[PDB]
Amino acid sequence: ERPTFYRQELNKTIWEVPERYQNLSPVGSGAYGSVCAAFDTKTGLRVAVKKLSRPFQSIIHAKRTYRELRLLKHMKHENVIGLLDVFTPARSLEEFNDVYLVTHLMGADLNNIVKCQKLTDDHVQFLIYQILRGLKYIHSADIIHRDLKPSNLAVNEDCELKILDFGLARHTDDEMTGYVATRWYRAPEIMLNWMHYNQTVDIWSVGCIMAELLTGRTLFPGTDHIDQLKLILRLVGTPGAELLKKISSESARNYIQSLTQMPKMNFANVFIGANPLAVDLLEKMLVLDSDKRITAAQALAHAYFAQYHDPDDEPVADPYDQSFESRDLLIDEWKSLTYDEVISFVPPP
Numbered sequence: 001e002r003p004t005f006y007r008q009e010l011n012k013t014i015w016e017v018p019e020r021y022q023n024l025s026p027v028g029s030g031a032y033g034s035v036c037a038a039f040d041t042k043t044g045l046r047v048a049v050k051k052l053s054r055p056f057q058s059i060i061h062a063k064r065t066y067r068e069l070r071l072l073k074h075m076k077h078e079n080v081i082g083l084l085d086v087f088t089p090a091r092s093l094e095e096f097n098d099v100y101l102v103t104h105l106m107g108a109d110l111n112n113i114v115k116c117q118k119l120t121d122d123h124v125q126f127l128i129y130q131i132l133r134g135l136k137y138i139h140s141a142d143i144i145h146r147d148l149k150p151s152n153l154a155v156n157e158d159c160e161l162k163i164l165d166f167g168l169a170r171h172t173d174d175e176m177t178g179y180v181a182t183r184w185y186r187a188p189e190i191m192l193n194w195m196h197y198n199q200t201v202d203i204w205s206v207g208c209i210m211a212e213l214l215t216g217r218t219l220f221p222g223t224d225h226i227d228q229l230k231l232i233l234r235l236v237g238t239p240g241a242e243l244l245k246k247i248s249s250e251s252a253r254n255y256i257q258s259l260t261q262m263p264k265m266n267f268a269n270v271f272i273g274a275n276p277l278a279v280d281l282l283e284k285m286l287v288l289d290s291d292k293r294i295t296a297a298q299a300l301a302h303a304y305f306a307q308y309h310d311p312d313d314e315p316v317a318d319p320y321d322q323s324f325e326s327r328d329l330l331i332d333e334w335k336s337l338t339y340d341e342v343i344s345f346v347p348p349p
């Protein structure tokens with residue numbers, strides 16, 4: 001049955017939410033939504049509430065709304081953000097116009113950790129183990145993150161980690177331009193649109209994150225796309241014939257061949273003092289040819305994680321139907337599908 005809703009304005013935005021959510025306080029805003037911290041009096045949890053901005057104003061926006069709702073309703077894993085609640089003030093499809101998503105409040109991220117704390121080898125093990133455990137689950141459903149970086153990893157006081165996506169706007173060209181953390185974690189094949197990419201892009205990003213936890217410094221802090229490519233190839237070596245053939249962009253292929261050939265560096269001399277097992281795992285993640293990178297499931301069994309690995313407690317996902325991705329539909333059609341998913345939501349136990 002329908003809860004009672006109350007109204008308030010916070011930063012020239014109307015919020016209409018069930019009474020159970022108290023003490024709304026703005027924590028972020030962007031082209032695709034606005035977020036408030038709140039207290040859920042029904043569960044006793046600190047929560048985040050996201051109000052989608054203009055969810056049905058174009059086909060593009062309407063498909064994106066449906067996409068996020070489908071993804072959050074599916075994800076049920078300890079190291080991955082889940083959906084606590086979803087609501088609308090609308091009493092019918094006819095008046096349906098706003099969509100609110102509720103999750104655990106994710107109050108500290110990994111950027112805060114690396115910036116403000118001393119991490120031991122054991123901390124690195126636990127944190128990277130959790131990211132790989134979550135990635136095994138997400139990848140098992142053929143979901144690719146594509147934007148893993150420290151700011152998308154939430155870490156509580158007990159060092160327990162969840163993967164999310166805080167982005168409240170679009171990755172435009174301008175956004176990826178210059179000396180920016182928005183690009184430092186991206187696999188080269190997407191940075192430079194070399195070929196059709198796949199889930200292995202996320203493993204490149206984990207390699208970058210793990211190196212920064214070990215040294216305290218960004219692995220590839222490029223001043224632009226080309227400077228960053230040079231930093232990468234200096235470390236892992238210029239590509240060979242086999243990889244070159246796989247770069248389907250004739251243009252990208254011709255540029256990379258203009259560069260003086262360089263060998264792969266000695267990672268023990270780059271990561272001075274690091275656990276040899278950590279050096280070995282980084283060599284297996286930071287491979288230019290995405291075909292040859294270690295997978296998340298493979299990495300969980302690597303000797304580096306012997307202290308944490310439990311093959312009976314690394315679950316996979318239920319089948320995830322994303323046939324909708326291929327479908328062209330009108331706005332009112334995407335809006336109706338979204339409504340059906342709002343109406344059918346069942347809270348976690």
Ligand SMILES: Cc1ccc(NC(=O)c2ccnc(N3CCOCC3)c2)cc1-c1ccc(C(=O)NCC2CC2)cc1
Nearest residue numbers: 027035048049050081101103105106107145163164165
């Ligand atoms: C409330 C909410 C609702 C939905 C989403 N969406 C996602 O996290 C999301 C959206 C799309 N894909 C994923 N993935 C992709 C695959 O990997 C798993 C996560 C995750 C995020 C949030 C959210 C949750 C918490 C916070 C938050 O705590 N903000 C505080 C501010 C200091 C930072 C902000 C936003």
